[model samples]
Target: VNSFSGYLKLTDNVYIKNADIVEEAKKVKPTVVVNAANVYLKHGGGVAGALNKATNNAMQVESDDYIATNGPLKVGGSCVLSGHNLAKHCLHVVGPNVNKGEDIQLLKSAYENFNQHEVLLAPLLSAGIFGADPIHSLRVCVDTVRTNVYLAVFDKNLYDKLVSSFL
Candidate 1:
């Protein structure tokens, strides 16, 4: 389990999770959640959808206004959403549409865009809707966020899978 999983040197910090997503949420009480979103900033599918579901689905309206003002977020782009009952903040990021050679670079850029010292939480991006491996996705996120980060990795199963795959 990632709760007990090994750490891959992420700059000067870590991505941590030892339990289910909701439990991790309660444990971490993070103010910011780094969410994976489409270019249009819709939190309607994949990990983004699950996050929207777990949190109160409040990202839509803010995202709607954001899209109207800024157009679809470009690849490796990011923005924040608010007035949510879950975390005090949400960092919406646009990820690489498909896994490619530059996958790490793209995701790293998107994550670095957050630039937060505040505790942040998030699921593995790209692995689901965006089609990158969870091992790859999660590692990149941690490396960039590089602070008090609480990462659930889409649940314990993926965590187990990562251990199995890496071992």
Candidate 2:
């Protein structure tokens, strides 16, 4: 476990670390934990899945209730959710799929849309099953935020890459 901690030299108040996102979030107690959600707000896999498991599927129930009430979220759009056994709230942001040719514009919009918090626990949006280039994903995240951000990079390889690139 690298378990490293650092900041992006070019950005203010951005903390990076290689750790379990859910575990870190529990420790830090950020105001919001951002979910890399699908358009349907299904919490099946990736960070979403981990969150669902950690919270005993209460997170998925909330997500389902939200989508059932408000309809599917569009790319770069978001909805706030109640954090079960975690942060005060969870922000579900639907990121654009890279295979659909969506670019940094949409990714940056996802970051900007839910940045209204004192501390945000964020995953690398669109970088996993959504097929986004991780470097581009990281850039979009780091460059377009105002409040304190804790980036939980779960993959060690990706963490190393991000460390070399940003730290």
Candidate 3:
């Protein structure tokens, strides 16, 4: 079993590699959840290639079935397109090497599409394949939100320090 030592201060539920979606929902009873996956990078890969790898990895996990049959789903990153058929909602937030204005618009639109009361589960974009520093990515994500935005991190202390000021 994979052991994780951290806490995620999310609105409701948070899932990692092998989360039990059904059980998680039963515990948190969230109205909605955004299924954001981790990004994998290969030597000569692009977004499409990385997404393919991520999808395959996610499928290997047992919770894949729960997500496949759930409602109000939103998968983050380009891998979202790969899981589109299995998810109710898919959000593509991956951009090229250089930052672009379009990324902000896409993120805004993705968040807006979700039901406001429901929890929005997203990964730390900076910690992903985007290769951006955590603070910079968090700045971008936090700036785009007008309401409560819960950030889940692998490091509880880090997350606390990052969000304490804002909270």
Angstrom error at residue 133, model 2: 1.1
lDDT of each: 0.65, 0.80, 0.38
Candidate 3, 103-131: lDDT as tens digits:
33344334443334344434445344444
Stretches off by above 4 angstroms in model 3 are 1-29, 35-92, 95-119, 164-167
Q: Ten consecutive residues with minimal summed lDDT in candidate 2?
A: 1-10
* TM-score to true structure, per model: 0.76, 0.88, 0.39
lDDT at 47, model 1? 61
Candidate 2: residue pairs that collide: none
| Residues 7-96 of candidate 2: C-alpha lDDT, one tens digit per residue | 343467677778778888677666788888888888888888888888999998888888788899889988888977877888888788
Who is ahead in TM-score, 2 or 3?
2
Question: How far in Å is the alpha carbon of 116 misplaced in model 3?
Answer: 8.4
Q: Which should have the higher lDDT, number 1 or number 3? A: 1
For residue 110, model 1's alpha carbon misses the true position, in angstroms, by 1.4
